[PDB]
Amino acid sequence: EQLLEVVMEGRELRKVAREASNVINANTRVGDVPIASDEEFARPTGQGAEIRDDGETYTTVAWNATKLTEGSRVTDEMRDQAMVDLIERNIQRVGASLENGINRVFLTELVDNAQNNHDTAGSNQGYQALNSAVGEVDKDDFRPDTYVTHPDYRTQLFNDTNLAYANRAGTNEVLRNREDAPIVGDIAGLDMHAAMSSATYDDGTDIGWSGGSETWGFSSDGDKGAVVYDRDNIHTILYAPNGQDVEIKDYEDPIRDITGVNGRLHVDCQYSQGRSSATVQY
Amino acid sequence: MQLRRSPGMRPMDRDWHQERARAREQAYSSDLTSQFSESEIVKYELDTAQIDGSDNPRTYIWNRTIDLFGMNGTDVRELRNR
Amino acid sequence: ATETQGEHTFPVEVLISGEELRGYTAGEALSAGEPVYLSGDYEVSASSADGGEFLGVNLYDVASGEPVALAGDDCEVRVEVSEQVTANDEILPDGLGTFETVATSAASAGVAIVQEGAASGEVCEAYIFAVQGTTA
Amino acid sequence: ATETQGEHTFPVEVLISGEELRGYTAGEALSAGEPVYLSGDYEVSASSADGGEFLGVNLYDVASGEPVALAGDDCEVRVEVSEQVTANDEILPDGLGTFETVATSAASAGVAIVQEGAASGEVCEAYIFAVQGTTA
Amino acid sequence: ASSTPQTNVDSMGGGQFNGQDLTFEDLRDIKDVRDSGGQVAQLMDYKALLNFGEGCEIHVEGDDETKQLVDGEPMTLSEWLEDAFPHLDLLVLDLGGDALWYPYAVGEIQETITGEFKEALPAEPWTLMPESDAQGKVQAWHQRTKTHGGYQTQTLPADDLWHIVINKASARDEVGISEVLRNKDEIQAFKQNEAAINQAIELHGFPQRHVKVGKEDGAPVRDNDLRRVRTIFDPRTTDANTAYFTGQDVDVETLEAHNFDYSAIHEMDMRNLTTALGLPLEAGNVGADGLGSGKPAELRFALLKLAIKANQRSFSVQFVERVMRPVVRDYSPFDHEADIRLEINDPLEDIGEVADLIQQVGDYMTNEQVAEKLDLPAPEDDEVADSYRSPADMEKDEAGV
Ligand SMILES: [K+]
Ligand SMILES: [K+]
Ligand SMILES: [Mg+2]
Ligand SMILES: [Mg+2]
Ligand SMILES: [Mg+2]
Ligand SMILES: [Mg+2]
Ligand SMILES: [Mg+2]
Ligand SMILES: [Mg+2]
Ligand SMILES: [Mg+2]
Ligand SMILES: [Mg+2]
Ligand SMILES: [Mg+2]
């Protein structure tokens, strides 16, 4: 006789920020991105008149990367008697909790600080909403290339007959493979789809976090369910003292027969140009 | 921090499985108080084990007072009609 | 105290942070997260309803006479409150295995301060900063 | 708080000893050595006068909404006082970002004990030994 | 068939490390076993010395046909390689040692300032971990190194490092296994029993004096009173000449040395550990009944020599393929597709058995083959090298006839 030496996994959240934004590996926890002023129009003037100067001017987007941390501690008796490697399992949980943290920092900047909005007002929430939101960014003379999406928005979108009927979509891929269909990442001039999890956005209900301004969702009047944006104009800034990325320490308490694992990373997320982004609203 | 006895950790403990199996194999009834110590009931969460006597081998074993045919120790769940 | 995830109920990890762990003997059966006090020589039992009875919180379920790990003062703990509470509230053992506020109790001073508010019958996060004994 | 050596002024290191250092969100802009209390869920703001509002001292300058490290009630610290203090004086927050004695305050119990005396506006050395919350 | 692997390989991690099958902490744990010294470290050093301590030889098939002017002077590829790697006997022992302790040996190619080849330079294996693709091949190397009070970390491409794996989970395993971590429980069992024995020898290995004072059921003796007795009977001041005089109500009892078989515990630990590390028990300075002679001996030394041969073959191939061929290709006028072999010598040859063989069957071997078996330079004259009868026998005839 031997036990079922297995553990069933819990829910695992979608991790995309590191692909769905410009990642800066910063040399310092605090820093600046220089921004140039917008284009203008040359002045009409008379012959012999002085050329009036109206040169480039500059400003910065500052970053202040905040340390996200997660950890655990177990007695050595528990390590020795565990059904599976508790240190390996806690290392995985710590790594996952930091990556989830990055995705929360990213999505909360992305959703709160987009400078344009398409209010669907119920109604035409499928392809027409994505096209409309591209139109909102296009009116500010940027162009988007990516969209970030809530599960309820995805569900609405894949019910749209324009995508669900193979003749209207040009392929049956959405009907067959749903979000894994290549057209879902090649729609309305956008060349990337970044599927998010529902829990990712900062509601301020989770401990240690103070909420964003919006509601992430797509089921009730006023929810923001997708963001259409320029991937080059949203920055995720990662800082680490001892390398480039997430650092996990495995340690023993010096005196108490306790072992633990602790993870850290510093992260900030900032728009370069918030005008390059539009939310879609229910 | 989580100790070996802490409530969130019990399912990871090899002993928690082994002694719950031991308790199932050793009971005659679901009535824990008559069979197990308060220590055993708390440490191994025996309320939540499906203890009832149905997994004790001795529930099924012949234990006759006069045994002419040398037949004591036979287990009924090994008969051909089972 | 317990958290729900689908079908599943998970016990909460009682001790959030804290260097202050000590072992006593259970004077009675006790359960994880109960406030407790000295009831005999190194013997620990459930706190009654007002001041003068608090040494720490029990970290795991015990029968009577078993060794008990306490989280003492200097620890941050996830504890159930019998009352709605807010950050900066001082809290005190309730006599019911929960805590309640000092403001609700007959006492004038608490043992832990709420860092993260909770509804009645719900898990707050609090920092234990004092112990209380017999002063008469 | 600052120290002079020749022409030069240096920042004072707030923490002398102790390991009870804990993380909160700043509810407002805060400055090194400033006493703070819980203004919300894991959020701290500058302490008002006369007690009931102290969790620890802010260890480095922060803007509003930044994460902040805080020295708790096992730490030994260098802190600025609004009045003359002497060894064995109990002290607590002024409302002015400094500390004053329990003797001058309307409160009856302190949060730190002065280990080295200092004049008004100078830096004393003190050991933080309690926290104070809402008791009503 | 196909030009790309189509079975999957169980290795592409979920995290943002490439799964980190071992982490930098585990690599420091191997380094900590190695630097701790004592009996465990000496056994694993004997393992390195058996596998790689006997040195090496380079062969090329058709080496004579490679004759080419390298720098006005002619060389063969073997001559060029022997000049490219002057101290290969040390390098083979060093890399082979590391590749037994750690999952891999690893290093750089290095150049002179002029850009001619300098050396294959090993890198500290506990500082480096590989990152690998969905078909299991290493794509990048991630390096973490100590600095004052902390760490510096960097990433390097697989393009310009090289690596060698002796112990593998599968023939596809490009990452390998540490024999230390594979046997960490036996190492712990050994070390814990060592400490337990040491403490028991102090408490129980030596008799201790117990003076009992006062009459049984008579007057009680207090601590104050025992201090005066302690002054009289103090071992720190006693000698072989010392005699004692007492009333009837003083008793000098002895706690005997309480015998336990620490020798049997050590021998059991050493049996478990040597067998776990694949060494014969004899390597641990422990003997055994019915195992010292005859077929019982010959088997264990055969098993040892087979293990050594298997490790040597595994190392030789990877050193030629991942180190020598790139160096020939990139810094040499010779063909890198030449049939290079690196042999590593058998540590347990009896030259007397070789000499017996040469006497018995030399009449069927060329003088070159005899020189190879005898570990000598082949004869200068290719005719005498190629011939079967002895060079001394050809000399006496060529002179005498
Ligand atoms: K009451
Ligand atoms: K005042
Ligand atoms: Mg700046
Ligand atoms: Mg002019
Ligand atoms: Mg202008
Ligand atoms: Mg606009
Ligand atoms: Mg499919
Ligand atoms: Mg101290
Ligand atoms: Mg602490
Ligand atoms: Mg303390
Ligand atoms: Mg008497």
Overview in brief:
The PDB classes it as virus. The structure is cut from a larger assembly and holds 1 copy of chain A (282 residues), 1 copy of chain B (82 residues), 2 copies of chain C (136 residues) and 1 copy of chain E (401 residues). Chain A is 24% helix and 27% strand.
Describe this structure in words.
- The structure is cut from a larger assembly and holds 1 copy of chain A (282 residues), 1 copy of chain B (82 residues), 2 copies of chain C (136 residues) and 1 copy of chain E (401 residues).
- With 282 residues, chain A is an alpha/beta fold.
- Chain A has 7 helices and 12 strands.
- In chain A, strands 1, 4, 9, 10 and 11 form a 5-stranded mixed β-sheet that branches. A 5-stranded mixed β-sheet of chain A has the order 5-12-8-6-7. Chain A has a two-stranded antiparallel sheet with strand order 2-3.
- Chain B has 2 helices and no strands.
- In chain B, 22% of the residues are buried.
- Helix content of chain B is 23%, strand content 0%.
- Chain B is mainly alpha-helical.
- The N and C termini of chain B lie far apart (50 Å).
- In chain E, 42% of the residues lie in helices and 17% in strands.
- Chain E contains 13 helices and 12 strands.
- In chain E, α2 packs across α4 and α6 packs antiparallel against α8.
- Chains in contact: A-B, A-C, A-D, A-E, B-C, C-D.
- Chains C and D meet through β12 of C and β5 of D.
- One potassium ion binds next to loops of chain C.
- The PDB classes it as virus.
Present the secondary structure layout.
The structure is cut from a larger assembly and holds 1 copy of chain A (282 residues), 1 copy of chain B (82 residues), 2 copies of chain C (136 residues) and 1 copy of chain E (401 residues).
Chain B (H helix, E strand, L loop, with lengths): L13 H13 L11 H6 L39
Chain C lengths: L1 E4 L2 E4 L3 E3 L3 E6 L8 E6 L2 E4 L9 E3 L8 E5 L4 E6 L8 E4 L5 E3 L10 E5 L5 E7 L8
Parallel strand pairs in C: 4-6
Antiparallel strand pairs in C: 1-2, 3-9, 4-8, 5-6, 5-7, 7-8, 9-13, 10-11, 10-12, 12-13
Chain E lengths: L23 H12 L2 H15 L3 E5 L7 E4 L1 E3 L1 H8 L3 H14 L3 E7 L5 E6 L5 E5 L5 E10 L2 E8 L3 E4 L14 H4 L1 H21 L3 E6 L9 H10 L17 E6 L6 H15 L18 H37 L8 E5 L6 H11 L5 H7 L8 H5 L4 H10 L1
Antiparallel strand pairs in E: 1-12, 2-3, 4-5, 4-9, 6-7, 7-8, 10-11
The site of one magnesium ion has 3 residues of chain C, from loops.
Write down the oligomeric state. part of a larger assembly
Q: Proportion of β residues of chain E? A: 15-25%
What are the bound molecules? potassium ion, magnesium ion
* Chains forming the largest contact: C-D, 24 and 21 residues
Number of helices of chain E: 13
Q: How far apart are the first and last residues' alpha carbons of chain C, in Å?
A: 33 Å
Biggest pleated-sheet summary of chain C: 6 strands, antiparallel
What's the count of strands of chain C?
Answer: 13
Gyration radius of chain E, to the nearest Å?
Answer: 32 Å
